[PDB]
Amino acid sequence: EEEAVRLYIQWLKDGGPSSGRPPPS
Numbered sequence: 261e262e263e264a265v266r267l268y269i270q271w272l273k274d275g276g277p278s279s280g281r282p283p284p285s
Contacts, residue, residue, distance in 0.1 A: 264285060
């Protein structure tokens with residue numbers, strides 16, 4: 261992937277934009 265993506269996608273796993281967090285990318 262990118263790893264800087266995996267936690268991004270991980271952000272996204274949480275819901276990214278609606279995850280509660282900001283994006284790790």
